[PDB]
Amino acid sequence: ARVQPVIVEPLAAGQGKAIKAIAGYSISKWEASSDAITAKATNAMSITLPHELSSEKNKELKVGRVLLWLGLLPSVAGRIKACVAEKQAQAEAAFQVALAVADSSKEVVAAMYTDAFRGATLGDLLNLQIYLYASEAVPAKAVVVHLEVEHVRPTFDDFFTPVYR
Amino acid sequence: KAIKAIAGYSISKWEASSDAITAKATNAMSITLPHELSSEKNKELKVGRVLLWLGLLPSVAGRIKACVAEKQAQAEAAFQVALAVADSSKEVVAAMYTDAFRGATLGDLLNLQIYLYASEAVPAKAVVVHLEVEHVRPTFDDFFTPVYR
Amino acid sequence: KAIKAIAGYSISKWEASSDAITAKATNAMSITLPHELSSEKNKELKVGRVLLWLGLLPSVAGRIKACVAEKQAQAEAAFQVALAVADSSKEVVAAMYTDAFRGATLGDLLNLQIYLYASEAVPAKAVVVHLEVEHVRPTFDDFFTPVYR
Amino acid sequence: MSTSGTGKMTRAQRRAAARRNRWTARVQPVIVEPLAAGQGKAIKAIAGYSISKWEASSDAITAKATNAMSITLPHELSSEKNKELKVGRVLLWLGLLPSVAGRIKACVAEKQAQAEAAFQVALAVADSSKEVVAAMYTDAFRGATLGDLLNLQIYLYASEAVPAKAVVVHLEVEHVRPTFDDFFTPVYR
Amino acid sequence: MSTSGTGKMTRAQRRAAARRNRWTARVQPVIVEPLAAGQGKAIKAIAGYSISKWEASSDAITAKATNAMSITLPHELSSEKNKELKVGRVLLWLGLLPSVAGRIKACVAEKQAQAEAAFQVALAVADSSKEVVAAMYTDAFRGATLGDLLNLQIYLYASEAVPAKAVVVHLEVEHVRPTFDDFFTPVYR
Ligand SMILES: [Mg+2]
Ligand SMILES: [Mg+2]
Ligand SMILES: [Mg+2]
């Protein structure tokens, strides 16, 4: 097996890494803006689900792959880790058991919850939480977390509603 | 007895809370476009037929109306050029702007307010209004974002 | 000139008697679901398009309306987000929730009341309201129960 | 002619004869994709093999000391019929609090006489300093009374003394799938 | 026999029968070549698409603050006929002085209300700490009034306050090629 004279090509921020979505399963995302966090402590917000898909019609949907990355000001105070688990009794307890976790010391500050939630009611999420810890204390809105999720298309974008009932 | 959208066309809707108003007078409000589509990218998308209707408290004043037209210099005059209008006196409290805007920059509308008149003065968040708008679905719709940022 | 249901879809209807109410105010009522389908079994069934209409004494107060939405925090505000509404002033005293709920746990609705407003205060059992709802027909429908209990 | 050897007007060209020169084989370029958290890989178990996992809460560890804990299984597989069951490759990893004091490691070997000595001999070792906080006991323990394991503790060391329940640790273990999973129970008892 | 299994005199040999053992697939060796400055890659534009580039000199930036600058195009493409032109994938990178105070980053998003907020949302981000001081807005802005862009500033942050013209920044942008490039002008005016 003769060696392969290869060459790692340089990757520049935001390059490649295209992430195809699955069939029928449409992906929709958004974000919750951080609330001030103390030093080393870890807050948690119930799922900031968007009203767009609050209808019991679509709220009673299912999911699959679910991303989670974050945007922090350039003036990022040290480092922070983030994740999500089942309405964790103990706050920090979440980090002791999530499949993924975005970190600020990682080239790619994001977490991929690969199938770990596959087949769960779109509503089933609100009884979930997002946990974020910080090295040194810090303000709110100081960071934004991006819940990037995929699931399915319902029966509405499809059309408008009742002209004359 | 239902309704349908178009080919490769999404119908993005949402509402905007009313700001209290005076009686007989008619206010206006530039469009509270949804961030998700505020990207010059899709902000420069094509629209289709679109409609506006309005949910309002039951306990509400005299029958009033509302429409939408180009950034109208005269708030009241916007109702003389309005293509369709959501009347309260009518059994249909909504207006259908079919082919009226069919084919326009999703960011066009911005330079175009919405007009509302009232018989009796009335409170804020006293009534909402929804905008079911046809527009071509964009790209990302079905695929994640590069983790590499 | 009639109407039709859907494939393998049943339309279960029934009414709920009104509890007297005050004028201008609007009450609410979680859903009086039919026992026959209160079984978590079918209680976790799929719904279709659904409508509400209302029979009421002839001799009744000022024209009033009514709708239905998620367990609304604000009784009155439920009418701003209502998908369709049964108005008395209209020639059609009913609301069509076509594809509005199409596809939802038959037990979902439970966590979702119904709203009614009135011009003049009014008696109890003073008016009923029927709910014609599309939902997939379940199983047992056509076969007895094991005598062996 | 060769590369973009398309110009205008005439222009001859000649080379030279020798014993070649360039390398024998030729190049291939690539692009290492940037992977995010959890994208990794949770290799599927094998034939008729189940992967039973579960965690055990930590014990207040001290300065540079290292504790141990006879690991015990859950009631299900705690059947004499299943106790004498066989195991496959198995791994341990650990979830812990974000705010961590120093870096630390952990492994597993036969009910060690010396607790620290474990780290001098275990096949793999879940290191915190490493990107992969886990150890793979592939074939390391393949084949063994699904009870054998009991007598055989797990070892954990810490640079900075630390609290209990300060961290858990999961054990994804390959073992032959039982039979309960399927069929119900004899109505006639 | 197998590897160098060529010796002298007799010497029998036997093995054993079981369920194999070694991994299923086999190995491949490689050699990452060391690349120098600029060897990288300047991917060519696409079909009927031009890549117009140019830079903008910096503004005296402060402590940890981050400025912004409505970016404007050059007179050529500044035609109403070309203004309503479409764009493709586009990137920004930056050339700066060698003697640099601290490390810093920069991006671009719709005329942000909050200047710092930009970094919480942009698709890519030219980071100094990174080996690649640039961001790729592939399809990120594909399709858009070659004027739209105007209303949409660019953001830059610095760890250590700093002078103006302290650094430039180029913007290689894909956009449909115009028609001027070719034909001359109507002699008859
Ligand atoms: Mg009339
Ligand atoms: Mg034995
Ligand atoms: Mg334009």
mmCIF file with all atom_site columns, all heavy atoms in Angstrom, chain A residues 125-139:
data_model
loop_
_atom_site.group_PDB
_atom_site.id
_atom_site.type_symbol
_atom_site.label_atom_id
_atom_site.label_alt_id
_atom_site.label_comp_id
_atom_site.label_asym_id
_atom_site.label_entity_id
_atom_site.label_seq_id
_atom_site.pdbx_PDB_ins_code
_atom_site.Cartn_x
_atom_site.Cartn_y
_atom_site.Cartn_z
_atom_site.occupancy
_atom_site.B_iso_or_equiv
_atom_site.pdbx_formal_charge
_atom_site.auth_seq_id
_atom_site.auth_comp_id
_atom_site.auth_asym_id
_atom_site.auth_atom_id
_atom_site.pdbx_PDB_model_num
ATOM 1   N N   . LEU A 1 125 ? -40.485 19.178 23.437 1.00 0.00 ? 125 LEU A N   1
ATOM 2   C CA  . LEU A 1 125 ? -39.270 19.914 23.745 1.00 0.00 ? 125 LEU A CA  1
ATOM 3   C C   . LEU A 1 125 ? -39.389 20.858 24.936 1.00 0.00 ? 125 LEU A C   1
ATOM 4   O O   . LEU A 1 125 ? -38.532 20.872 25.803 1.00 0.00 ? 125 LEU A O   1
ATOM 5   C CB  . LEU A 1 125 ? -38.804 20.682 22.509 1.00 0.00 ? 125 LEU A CB  1
ATOM 6   C CG  . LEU A 1 125 ? -39.508 20.249 21.222 1.00 0.00 ? 125 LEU A CG  1
ATOM 7   C CD1 . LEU A 1 125 ? -39.086 21.145 20.087 1.00 0.00 ? 125 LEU A CD1 1
ATOM 8   C CD2 . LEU A 1 125 ? -39.189 18.811 20.898 1.00 0.00 ? 125 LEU A CD2 1
ATOM 9   N N   . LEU A 1 126 ? -40.456 21.638 24.994 1.00 0.00 ? 126 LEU A N   1
ATOM 10  C CA  . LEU A 1 126 ? -40.622 22.583 26.090 1.00 0.00 ? 126 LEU A CA  1
ATOM 11  C C   . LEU A 1 126 ? -40.317 22.029 27.493 1.00 0.00 ? 126 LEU A C   1
ATOM 12  O O   . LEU A 1 126 ? -40.011 22.798 28.415 1.00 0.00 ? 126 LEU A O   1
ATOM 13  C CB  . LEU A 1 126 ? -42.031 23.174 26.039 1.00 0.00 ? 126 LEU A CB  1
ATOM 14  C CG  . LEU A 1 126 ? -42.344 24.042 24.811 1.00 0.00 ? 126 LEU A CG  1
ATOM 15  C CD1 . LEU A 1 126 ? -41.365 25.209 24.732 1.00 0.00 ? 126 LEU A CD1 1
ATOM 16  C CD2 . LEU A 1 126 ? -42.283 23.195 23.546 1.00 0.00 ? 126 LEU A CD2 1
ATOM 17  N N   . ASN A 1 127 ? -40.405 20.709 27.664 1.00 0.00 ? 127 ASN A N   1
ATOM 18  C CA  . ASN A 1 127 ? -40.097 20.101 28.958 1.00 0.00 ? 127 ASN A CA  1
ATOM 19  C C   . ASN A 1 127 ? -38.614 19.768 28.937 1.00 0.00 ? 127 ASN A C   1
ATOM 20  O O   . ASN A 1 127 ? -38.143 18.858 29.622 1.00 0.00 ? 127 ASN A O   1
ATOM 21  C CB  . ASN A 1 127 ? -40.912 18.828 29.209 1.00 0.00 ? 127 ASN A CB  1
ATOM 22  C CG  . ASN A 1 127 ? -41.556 18.278 27.956 1.00 0.00 ? 127 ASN A CG  1
ATOM 23  O OD1 . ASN A 1 127 ? -41.603 18.935 26.920 1.00 0.00 ? 127 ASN A OD1 1
ATOM 24  N ND2 . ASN A 1 127 ? -42.063 17.056 28.049 1.00 0.00 ? 127 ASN A ND2 1
ATOM 25  N N   . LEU A 1 128 ? -37.904 20.527 28.109 1.00 0.00 ? 128 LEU A N   1
ATOM 26  C CA  . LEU A 1 128 ? -36.462 20.424 27.928 1.00 0.00 ? 128 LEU A CA  1
ATOM 27  C C   . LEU A 1 128 ? -35.926 21.772 28.352 1.00 0.00 ? 128 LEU A C   1
ATOM 28  O O   . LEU A 1 128 ? -36.688 22.708 28.601 1.00 0.00 ? 128 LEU A O   1
ATOM 29  C CB  . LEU A 1 128 ? -36.104 20.227 26.454 1.00 0.00 ? 128 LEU A CB  1
ATOM 30  C CG  . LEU A 1 128 ? -35.671 18.858 25.942 1.00 0.00 ? 128 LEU A CG  1
ATOM 31  C CD1 . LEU A 1 128 ? -34.309 18.525 26.508 1.00 0.00 ? 128 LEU A CD1 1
ATOM 32  C CD2 . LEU A 1 128 ? -36.700 17.813 26.336 1.00 0.00 ? 128 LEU A CD2 1
ATOM 33  N N   . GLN A 1 129 ? -34.613 21.881 28.422 1.00 0.00 ? 129 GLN A N   1
ATOM 34  C CA  . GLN A 1 129 ? -34.013 23.144 28.785 1.00 0.00 ? 129 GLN A CA  1
ATOM 35  C C   . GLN A 1 129 ? -32.674 23.218 28.097 1.00 0.00 ? 129 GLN A C   1
ATOM 36  O O   . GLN A 1 129 ? -32.156 22.214 27.608 1.00 0.00 ? 129 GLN A O   1
ATOM 37  C CB  . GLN A 1 129 ? -33.840 23.260 30.303 1.00 0.00 ? 129 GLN A CB  1
ATOM 38  C CG  . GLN A 1 129 ? -34.769 24.269 30.959 1.00 0.00 ? 129 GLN A CG  1
ATOM 39  C CD  . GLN A 1 129 ? -35.580 23.661 32.093 1.00 0.00 ? 129 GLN A CD  1
ATOM 40  O OE1 . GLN A 1 129 ? -36.785 23.409 31.962 1.00 0.00 ? 129 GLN A OE1 1
ATOM 41  N NE2 . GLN A 1 129 ? -34.918 23.421 33.220 1.00 0.00 ? 129 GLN A NE2 1
ATOM 42  N N   . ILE A 1 130 ? -32.134 24.426 28.048 1.00 0.00 ? 130 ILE A N   1
ATOM 43  C CA  . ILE A 1 130 ? -30.849 24.680 27.427 1.00 0.00 ? 130 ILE A CA  1
ATOM 44  C C   . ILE A 1 130 ? -29.972 25.204 28.548 1.00 0.00 ? 130 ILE A C   1
ATOM 45  O O   . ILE A 1 130 ? -30.347 26.155 29.234 1.00 0.00 ? 130 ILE A O   1
ATOM 46  C CB  . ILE A 1 130 ? -30.983 25.743 26.320 1.00 0.00 ? 130 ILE A CB  1
ATOM 47  C CG1 . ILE A 1 130 ? -32.388 25.681 25.698 1.00 0.00 ? 130 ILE A CG1 1
ATOM 48  C CG2 . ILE A 1 130 ? -29.930 25.509 25.263 1.00 0.00 ? 130 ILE A CG2 1
ATOM 49  C CD1 . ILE A 1 130 ? -32.972 27.036 25.280 1.00 0.00 ? 130 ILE A CD1 1
ATOM 50  N N   . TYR A 1 131 ? -28.814 24.583 28.739 1.00 0.00 ? 131 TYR A N   1
ATOM 51  C CA  . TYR A 1 131 ? -27.915 24.980 29.820 1.00 0.00 ? 131 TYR A CA  1
ATOM 52  C C   . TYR A 1 131 ? -26.606 25.604 29.341 1.00 0.00 ? 131 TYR A C   1
ATOM 53  O O   . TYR A 1 131 ? -25.926 25.040 28.488 1.00 0.00 ? 131 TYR A O   1
ATOM 54  C CB  . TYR A 1 131 ? -27.638 23.760 30.707 1.00 0.00 ? 131 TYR A CB  1
ATOM 55  C CG  . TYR A 1 131 ? -28.901 22.992 31.061 1.00 0.00 ? 131 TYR A CG  1
ATOM 56  C CD1 . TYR A 1 131 ? -29.496 22.122 30.145 1.00 0.00 ? 131 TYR A CD1 1
ATOM 57  C CD2 . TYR A 1 131 ? -29.523 23.166 32.302 1.00 0.00 ? 131 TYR A CD2 1
ATOM 58  C CE1 . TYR A 1 131 ? -30.677 21.446 30.455 1.00 0.00 ? 131 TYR A CE1 1
ATOM 59  C CE2 . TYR A 1 131 ? -30.706 22.494 32.621 1.00 0.00 ? 131 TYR A CE2 1
ATOM 60  C CZ  . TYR A 1 131 ? -31.275 21.639 31.694 1.00 0.00 ? 131 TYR A CZ  1
ATOM 61  O OH  . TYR A 1 131 ? -32.446 20.984 31.997 1.00 0.00 ? 131 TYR A OH  1
ATOM 62  N N   . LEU A 1 132 ? -26.261 26.765 29.906 1.00 0.00 ? 132 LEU A N   1
ATOM 63  C CA  . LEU A 1 132 ? -25.042 27.502 29.538 1.00 0.00 ? 132 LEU A CA  1
ATOM 64  C C   . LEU A 1 132 ? -24.215 27.933 30.753 1.00 0.00 ? 132 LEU A C   1
ATOM 65  O O   . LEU A 1 132 ? -24.734 28.570 31.669 1.00 0.00 ? 132 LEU A O   1
ATOM 66  C CB  . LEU A 1 132 ? -25.413 28.750 28.732 1.00 0.00 ? 132 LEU A CB  1
ATOM 67  C CG  . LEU A 1 132 ? -26.518 29.601 29.378 1.00 0.00 ? 132 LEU A CG  1
ATOM 68  C CD1 . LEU A 1 132 ? -26.441 31.025 28.855 1.00 0.00 ? 132 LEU A CD1 1
ATOM 69  C CD2 . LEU A 1 132 ? -27.890 29.000 29.087 1.00 0.00 ? 132 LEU A CD2 1
ATOM 70  N N   . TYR A 1 133 ? -22.927 27.595 30.751 1.00 0.00 ? 133 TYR A N   1
ATOM 71  C CA  . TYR A 1 133 ? -22.041 27.950 31.858 1.00 0.00 ? 133 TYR A CA  1
ATOM 72  C C   . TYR A 1 133 ? -20.959 28.900 31.363 1.00 0.00 ? 133 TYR A C   1
ATOM 73  O O   . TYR A 1 133 ? -20.563 28.822 30.203 1.00 0.00 ? 133 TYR A O   1
ATOM 74  C CB  . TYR A 1 133 ? -21.395 26.686 32.446 1.00 0.00 ? 133 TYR A CB  1
ATOM 75  C CG  . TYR A 1 133 ? -19.914 26.822 32.742 1.00 0.00 ? 133 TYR A CG  1
ATOM 76  C CD1 . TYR A 1 133 ? -19.460 27.082 34.038 1.00 0.00 ? 133 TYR A CD1 1
ATOM 77  C CD2 . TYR A 1 133 ? -18.968 26.707 31.723 1.00 0.00 ? 133 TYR A CD2 1
ATOM 78  C CE1 . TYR A 1 133 ? -18.095 27.224 34.308 1.00 0.00 ? 133 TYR A CE1 1
ATOM 79  C CE2 . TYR A 1 133 ? -17.605 26.849 31.982 1.00 0.00 ? 133 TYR A CE2 1
ATOM 80  C CZ  . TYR A 1 133 ? -17.175 27.107 33.273 1.00 0.00 ? 133 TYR A CZ  1
ATOM 81  O OH  . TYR A 1 133 ? -15.828 27.235 33.517 1.00 0.00 ? 133 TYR A OH  1
ATOM 82  N N   . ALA A 1 134 ? -20.473 29.779 32.239 1.00 0.00 ? 134 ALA A N   1
ATOM 83  C CA  . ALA A 1 134 ? -19.426 30.731 31.855 1.00 0.00 ? 134 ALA A CA  1
ATOM 84  C C   . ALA A 1 134 ? -18.247 30.775 32.821 1.00 0.00 ? 134 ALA A C   1
ATOM 85  O O   . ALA A 1 134 ? -18.417 30.644 34.032 1.00 0.00 ? 134 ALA A O   1
ATOM 86  C CB  . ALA A 1 134 ? -20.013 32.127 31.719 1.00 0.00 ? 134 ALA A CB  1
ATOM 87  N N   . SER A 1 135 ? -17.050 30.961 32.275 1.00 0.00 ? 135 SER A N   1
ATOM 88  C CA  . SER A 1 135 ? -15.859 31.051 33.103 1.00 0.00 ? 135 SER A CA  1
ATOM 89  C C   . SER A 1 135 ? -16.118 32.167 34.113 1.00 0.00 ? 135 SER A C   1
ATOM 90  O O   . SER A 1 135 ? -16.398 31.895 35.278 1.00 0.00 ? 135 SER A O   1
ATOM 91  C CB  . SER A 1 135 ? -14.635 31.376 32.239 1.00 0.00 ? 135 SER A CB  1
ATOM 92  O OG  . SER A 1 135 ? -14.311 30.291 31.384 1.00 0.00 ? 135 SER A OG  1
ATOM 93  N N   . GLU A 1 136 ? -16.043 33.418 33.662 1.00 0.00 ? 136 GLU A N   1
ATOM 94  C CA  . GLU A 1 136 ? -16.297 34.560 34.540 1.00 0.00 ? 136 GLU A CA  1
ATOM 95  C C   . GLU A 1 136 ? -17.689 35.104 34.282 1.00 0.00 ? 136 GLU A C   1
ATOM 96  O O   . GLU A 1 136 ? -18.208 35.015 33.165 1.00 0.00 ? 136 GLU A O   1
ATOM 97  C CB  . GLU A 1 136 ? -15.278 35.680 34.313 1.00 0.00 ? 136 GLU A CB  1
ATOM 98  C CG  . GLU A 1 136 ? -14.816 35.818 32.881 1.00 0.00 ? 136 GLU A CG  1
ATOM 99  C CD  . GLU A 1 136 ? -13.588 34.978 32.598 1.00 0.00 ? 136 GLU A CD  1
ATOM 100 O OE1 . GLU A 1 136 ? -12.576 35.145 33.312 1.00 0.00 ? 136 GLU A OE1 1
ATOM 101 O OE2 . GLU A 1 136 ? -13.636 34.147 31.666 1.00 0.00 ? 136 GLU A OE2 1
ATOM 102 N N   . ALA A 1 137 ? -18.286 35.671 35.323 1.00 0.00 ? 137 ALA A N   1
ATOM 103 C CA  . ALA A 1 137 ? -19.621 36.233 35.224 1.00 0.00 ? 137 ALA A CA  1
ATOM 104 C C   . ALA A 1 137 ? -19.745 37.031 33.936 1.00 0.00 ? 137 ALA A C   1
ATOM 105 O O   . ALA A 1 137 ? -18.743 37.338 33.277 1.00 0.00 ? 137 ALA A O   1
ATOM 106 C CB  . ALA A 1 137 ? -19.912 37.123 36.429 1.00 0.00 ? 137 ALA A CB  1
ATOM 107 N N   . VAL A 1 138 ? -20.977 37.378 33.586 1.00 0.00 ? 138 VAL A N   1
ATOM 108 C CA  . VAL A 1 138 ? -21.206 38.113 32.361 1.00 0.00 ? 138 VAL A CA  1
ATOM 109 C C   . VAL A 1 138 ? -22.662 38.565 32.206 1.00 0.00 ? 138 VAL A C   1
ATOM 110 O O   . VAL A 1 138 ? -23.563 38.021 32.847 1.00 0.00 ? 138 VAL A O   1
ATOM 111 C CB  . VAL A 1 138 ? -20.779 37.236 31.169 1.00 0.00 ? 138 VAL A CB  1
ATOM 112 C CG1 . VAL A 1 138 ? -21.925 37.081 30.182 1.00 0.00 ? 138 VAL A CG1 1
ATOM 113 C CG2 . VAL A 1 138 ? -19.535 37.827 30.524 1.00 0.00 ? 138 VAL A CG2 1
ATOM 114 N N   . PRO A 1 139 ? -22.906 39.571 31.346 1.00 0.00 ? 139 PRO A N   1
ATOM 115 C CA  . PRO A 1 139 ? -24.246 40.110 31.096 1.00 0.00 ? 139 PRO A CA  1
ATOM 116 C C   . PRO A 1 139 ? -25.209 39.179 30.383 1.00 0.00 ? 139 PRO A C   1
ATOM 117 O O   . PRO A 1 139 ? -24.895 38.029 30.073 1.00 0.00 ? 139 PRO A O   1
ATOM 118 C CB  . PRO A 1 139 ? -23.981 41.355 30.257 1.00 0.00 ? 139 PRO A CB  1
ATOM 119 C CG  . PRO A 1 139 ? -22.723 41.033 29.542 1.00 0.00 ? 139 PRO A CG  1
ATOM 120 C CD  . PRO A 1 139 ? -21.891 40.284 30.550 1.00 0.00 ? 139 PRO A CD  1
#
